[PDB]
């Protein structure tokens, strides 16, 4: 029934090699042993988990090859049976565990106090897993291959079971954290002795009968009582990773795959971001009754080892490099959509929105949003959609949306228990709306509920803090000078006031402009790079945006007085400019607020500790250019 098959691997010698590697391996190339230092941290309880790097094992095997000693191929044997090798790794960690350099606070650890007492009363008494307070993990092998190469859900195969492997795909959902009894401790009063049971299955049958030798000697039939303070418990969480849309074949739906995340690895993931997680693919045993029907067919799962989501001194150095390159605001603006030619003012406004303004909350309770919102109004074929998609790609958490593609309620929060909508997915990001003119005013009301106050009201509520961007075509598909600017915008004055700035661009034939645009476009076609200033990398651009946001500049007396004078001037200019052809909308105290946020964003981009009158004038100039683009005609 059990035909033994000798295989070209010996677990004893492999574990001896693992224990040797734990003590010998050190980050000398990066520079006691590094693994020994991690073990000492775990002994101090400063480290609650262990992660064994497959690249470290490969480097140790290469060192053994240089020494001439034959490598046990530990890195490859991990790919062979990582689940089996993990127990040997834990045993080697127990063997090579240093004494705690720092006190473990054993008195606070009721389990430790009771463990000393139980050993004294007893004088593998308790499970080694119960003795261990750390969780093993495996770092994916460095590229130089199943673990190193990420896989899709459909790409994964049943042969990959028992093997460490990395996967790529959208996280469909994450199960709520639940306790997991790694070891259940049973206690019986009749014996006075504790009996431990180690649970390694999805479900367990309680002992329900005292196994204590004291109860056996007394002949009493004791009723075991589980103790939460004595039984080991570990957080258990599940994740559903679904295949990336590119990985999905045409005409096929991506498949979500359940993943088991336990211990310190629990709660690490968020559904919004794509994750590249290396984990030992393993079968999921069926229950008894369901397995009787399933037969040889078996369920499967993945136990994550190393989790990585796509999206300091180095960041500070990069920001300093951008500052040394200089003119950072205009440089980032030109870096936005380098393939697109022109629209530098729109790019600068987009960069200001990306940096955002300072969010202010008064002591009395008033809260003024610091997030900036922008709108783009342009004739067809002016790269409105292209610029919006480029901005969405620039935003790590931003979401691109279309007015016809998604309902306003669905974008704010799509009803199926509530689930986050496109705006919630745009939390700490920028929600982009393509063809915003086509979007219905009914959904625009839902957008207006959130633009003025970040929170969403439905009951269920979410903070929904984000920056709003909109791209709209002018009424009848193109701008009409006979139509007023407000008529061509075709938007509510509430929307205009909630928006910090709206940009109007017109398509006017021009020989030199056509020649320059054709030159840039032909250069882009013949060579993917734009002809010409070098755009900053998107990672450094996002880092600079975060560094600007960290500044949080405050207004000064001179800047505030100048902004008040500008507010009076704008109100008077609206009172005199009731002519619809020249009227862009009445002056707004809230708009001066939006102006305050834009000045704060400019001072953030300049990294000024306080807002500057130059920043306020630059924001006013952005609005002035928004009007002057139409004035030029």
């Amino acid at each position: 029934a059990l035909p033994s098959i000798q295989l070209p691997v010996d677990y004893n010698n492999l574990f001896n090699e693992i224990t040797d590697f734990l003590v010998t391996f050190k980050q000398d190339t990066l520079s006691g042993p590094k693994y020994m230092a991690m073990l000492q941290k775990v002994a101090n309880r400063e480290l609650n988990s262990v992660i064994i790097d497959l690249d470290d094992i490969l480097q140790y095997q290469n060192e053994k090859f240089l020494q001439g000693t034959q490598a046990d191929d530990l890195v490859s044997a991990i790919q062979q049976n990582a689940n089996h090798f993990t127990e040997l790794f834990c045993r080697a960690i127990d063997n090579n565990m240093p004494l705690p350099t720092k006190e473990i606070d054993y008195k606070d650890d009721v389990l430790d106090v009771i463990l000393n007492q139980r050993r004294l009363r007893n004088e593998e008494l308790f499970p080694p897993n119960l003795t261990r307070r750390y969780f093993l993990y495996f770092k994916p092998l460095s590229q130089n291959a199943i673990s190193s190469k990420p896989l899709s859900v459909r790409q994964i195969k049943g042969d990959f079971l028992g093997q460490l492997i990395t996967v790529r795909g959208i996280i469909t959902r994450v199960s709520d954290v639940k306790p997991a009894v790694e070891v259940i401790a049973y206690t019986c009063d009749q014996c006075g002795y504790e009996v431990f049971q180690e649970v390694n299955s999805r479900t367990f049958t309680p002992l329900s009968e005292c196994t204590s030798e004291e109860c056996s000697q007394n002949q009493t039939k004791g009723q075991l009582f589980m103790s939460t303070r004595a039984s080991k418990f570990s957080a258990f969480q599940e994740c559903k990773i679904q295949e990336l849309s590119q990985q999905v074949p045409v005409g096929h739906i991506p498949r979500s795959l359940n993943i088991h995340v336990n211990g310190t690895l629990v709660r690490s993931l968020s559904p919004g971001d794509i994750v590249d997680v290396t984990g030992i693919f393993l079968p999921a045993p069926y229950t008894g009754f369901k397995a009787l029907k399933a037969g040889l067919l078996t369920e499967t799962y993945l136990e994550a080892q190393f989790v990585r989501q796509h999206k300091t001194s180095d960041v500070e150095e990069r920001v300093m490099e951008l500052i040394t390159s200089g003119d950072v605001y205009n440089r980032l603006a030109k870096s936005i959509a380098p393939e697109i030619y022109g629209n530098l003012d729109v790019k600068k406004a987009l960069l200001l929105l990306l940096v955002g303004g300072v969010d202010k909350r008064v002591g009395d309770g008033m809260k003024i949003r610091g997030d900036i919102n922008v709108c783009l109004m342009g004739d067809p074929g002016v790269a409105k959609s292209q610029l919006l998609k480029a901005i969405c790609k620039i935003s790590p958490r931003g979401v691109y949306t279309t007015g016809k593609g998604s309902s306003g309620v669905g974008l704010t929060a799509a009803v199926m228990i509530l689930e986050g909508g496109a705006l919630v997915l745009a939390d700490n990001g920028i929600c982009c709306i393509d063809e915003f003119d086509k979007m219905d005013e009914s959904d625009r009301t839902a957008i207006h509920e959130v633009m003025e106050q970040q929170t969403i009201s439905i009951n269920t509520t979410l903070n929904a803090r984000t920056s709003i961007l909109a791209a709209a075509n002018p009424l009848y598909g193109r701008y009409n000078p006979r139509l007023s600017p407000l008529d061509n915008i075709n938007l509510p004055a509430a929307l205009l006031s909630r928006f910090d700035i709206l940009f109007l661009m017109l398509d006017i034939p021009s020989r030199d402009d056509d020649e320059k645009l054709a030159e840039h476009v032909t250069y882009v076609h013949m060579h993917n790079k734009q002809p010409d200033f070098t755009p900053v990398e998107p990672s450094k651009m996002r880092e600079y945006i975060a560094y600007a946001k960290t500044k949080r500049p405050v207004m000064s007396e001179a800047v505030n007085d100048y902004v008040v004078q500008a507010y009076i001037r704008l109100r008077q200019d609206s009172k005199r400019e009731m002519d619809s052809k020249f009227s862009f909308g009445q002056a707004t105290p809230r708009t001066l607020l939006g102006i305050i946020r834009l000045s704060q964003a400019l001072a953030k981009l300049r990294l000024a500790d306080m807002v500057d009158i130059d920043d306020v004038e630059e924001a006013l100039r952005l609005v002035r250019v928004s009007k002057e683009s139409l004035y030029q005609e």
Partner: protein, 623 residues
């Protein structure tokens, strides 16, 4: 000695530390731990706080004794015992209960006041520690925190019905008619293998009888995580709080409650019949103490002095939103609504309702919803809603299967209701609100479940003008865009419009710039004004008098000359009773009715409103 298991600390030592806290621990120790020696009083400090508390429990006749972890920390040995409690809250709580009972017996003997030691023994003293730790949400709670004392604040999503608890099993032998009672420990009954009576000589003859079995009161209350504790991106996780005996039903659902307790984790059976239990353990918090989140004599004296001041009406208006500018009339109407009119019930004509509902319309940047959030903060019970987020069914009642659930307006009942984007609010929701406001109560009929829920809520509404900015040419009622039935239902209608002048712009810009100029920037304190409204309702019950009746009849006839709804006259009477509460006048007066009519005239800018069609000139608004 007797020691709690795994603690290496004597249970007798814990009881002795609790006894040293109960007696031979001065209130001066707690006052010194609080410091603030100028605030502390030497005589009460010299008196023993816990001795006085045990004597107060004896005077009350109740075994339960409220406990302060701060006072436990104040006494030194009791602080050591409180740390031992933080390690083992349930065991130390039982020890402190026994210590409170023993100290009560000793205190009865010492005071020589009449009492029964047998009555103290029959009583089971309760220790209810509080301030053991900072309040935390259920999502913040952890399995390591399980079986450790903690203080938690949470808003009750709902309170479950009282659950019977098997305090003691009772065994009655069917074979031999034997009667027995078996105490229930750890929630498990004990059954002898053989008959309790040797003469019966029947194995397993004893049979449990549920009615004979003793039952202790028990209850659970669902508790949402506190709004600050909840993540900004997701709704709070909720954990029900176990409660029993006096702690059961301590706080009603829908009101914030702070319950100190020890977190508990219990195995969950894989099947109810099967002995197997899932490795995951369901988590719940058993509350050692239950607490919320009435005017003190000094607060009532302060409220009386304020009400004596003639400036106090405008002072409370400004105090509602001290930082806000230029909406003092709307705030005064809101303060009158918070005071509320008096309610009268009669066999004929139904019951006139004193609660006042206020509708406010303001052009964008009116700070109307800033003032509305200020009113929500000022209200003892606050309900805030957005018109886009408001739903009629959610406002009236919901059904879960099939039992009716409280509506948003019903939850607002017992407090002021705040509505933002009221112009954006659906006209169908306003139609649902019309009947509820006219009746001051909600009646719901539906398939399967038909029931009425109380909706006696003062209602404040912040509304956009129908035009994006308020138009003087537009009628004020049309700009508010409220349906006429709902406008009649509302006791007050408020109209606010921005007025532009160079000096006024200088003033407004100076206010905003001053708040900005501070790095962090007559008004009663908001809590003191909430207490003043509560004291006004408690000690002032205004009723229509002869002078107020002359004013009311004159106002009704004059408004009919100007058409007057009979509900508006009742609303004016409610606002007059509200004004008497604002003035702390026991009965409505002609000045109160005159102020109520003046408040309504000022609220809607009726004095500003042009005589024809109800439109208001913009210059007339803001005088």
């Amino acid at each position: 000695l007797r020691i709690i298991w795994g603690t290496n600390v004597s249970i007798q030592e814990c009881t002795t530390n609790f006894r040293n806290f109960l007696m031979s621990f001065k209130y001066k120790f707690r006052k010194i731990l609080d410091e603030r020696e100028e605030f502390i009083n030497n005589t009460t400090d010299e008196e023993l706080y816990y001795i006085k508390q045990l004597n107060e429990m004896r005077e009350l006749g109740t075994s339960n004794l409220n406990l302060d972890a701060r006072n436990l920390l104040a006494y030194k040995q009791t602080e050591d015992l409180y740390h031992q409690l933080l390690n083992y809250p349930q065991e130390v709580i039982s020890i402190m209960d026994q210590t409170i009972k023993d100290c009560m017996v000793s205190l009865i003997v010492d005071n020589n006041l009449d009492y029964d030691l047998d009555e103290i023994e029959t009583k089971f003293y309760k220790v209810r520690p509080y301030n053991v730790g900072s309040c935390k949400g259920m999502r913040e709670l952890n399995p390591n925190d399980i079986d450790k004392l903690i203080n938690l604040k949470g808003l009750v999503l709902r309170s479950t019905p009282v659950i019977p608890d098997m305090k003691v099993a009772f065994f009655k032998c069917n074979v031999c008619d034997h009667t027995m009672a078996v105490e229930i420990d750890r929630g498990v009954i004990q059954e002898p293998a053989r008959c309790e009576r040797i003469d019966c000589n029947e194995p397993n003859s004893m049979s449990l009888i549920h009615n004979r079995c003793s039952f202790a009161d028990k209850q659970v209350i669902k508790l949402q995580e506190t709004p600050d504790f909840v993540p900004d991106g997701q709704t709070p996780h909720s954990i029900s709080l176990c409660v029993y005996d006096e702690l059961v039903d301590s706080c009603r659902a829908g009101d914030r409650i702070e319950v100190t307790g020890t977190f508990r984790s219990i195995p969950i059976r894989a099947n109810s019949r099967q002995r197997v239990l899932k490795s995951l353990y369901k988590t719940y918090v058993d509350v050692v103490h239950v607490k919320k989140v009435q005017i003190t004599d000094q607060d009532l004296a302060k409220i009386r002095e304020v009400a004596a001041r003639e400036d106090l009406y405008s002072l409370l208006a400004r105090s509602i939103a001290p930082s806000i500018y230029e909406l003092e009339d709307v705030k005064k109407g809101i303060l009158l609504q918070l005071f509320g009119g008096t309610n009268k019930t009669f066999t004929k004509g139904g019951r006139y309702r004193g609660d006042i509902n206020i509708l406010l319309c303001g052009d964008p940047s009116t700070s109307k919803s800033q003032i509305l959030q200020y009113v929500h903060k000022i209200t003892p019970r606050g309900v805030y809603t957005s018109g886009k987020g408001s739903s009629a069914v959610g406002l009236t009642a919901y059904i879960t299967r099939l039992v009716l659930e409280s509506g948003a307006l019903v939850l607002s009942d017992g407090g002021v209701c705040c509505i933002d984007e009221f112009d954006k609010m659906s006209d169908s929701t306003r139609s649902v609100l019309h009947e509820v406001m006219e009746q001051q109560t909600i009646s719901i009929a539906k398939a399967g479940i038909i029931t009425t829920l109380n909706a006696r809520s003062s209602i404040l509404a912040s509304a956009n003008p129908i035009g994006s900015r308020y138009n003087p040419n537009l009628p004020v009622t049309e700009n508010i865009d409220l349906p006429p039935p709902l406008l009649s239902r509302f006791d007050l209608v408020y109209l606010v419009l921005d007025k532009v002048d160079e000096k006024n712009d200088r003033e407004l810009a100076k206010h905003l710039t001053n708040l900005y100029l501070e790095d962090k920037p007559d008004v009663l304190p908001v809590e003191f004004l909430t207490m003043y409204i509560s004291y006004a309702k408690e000690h002032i019950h205004p009723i229509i008098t002869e002078a107020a009746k002359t004013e009311l009849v004159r106002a009704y006839v004059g408004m009919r000359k100007m058409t007057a709804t009979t509900r508006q006259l009742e609303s004016m009477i409610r606002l007059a009773e509200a004004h008497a509460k604002m003035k702390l006048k026991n009965v409505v007066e002609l000045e109160d009715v005159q102020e109520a009519v003046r408040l309504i005239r000022s609220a809607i800018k009726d004095y500003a409103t042009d005589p024809k069609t109800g439109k208001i000139d913009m210059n007339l608004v803001q005088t």
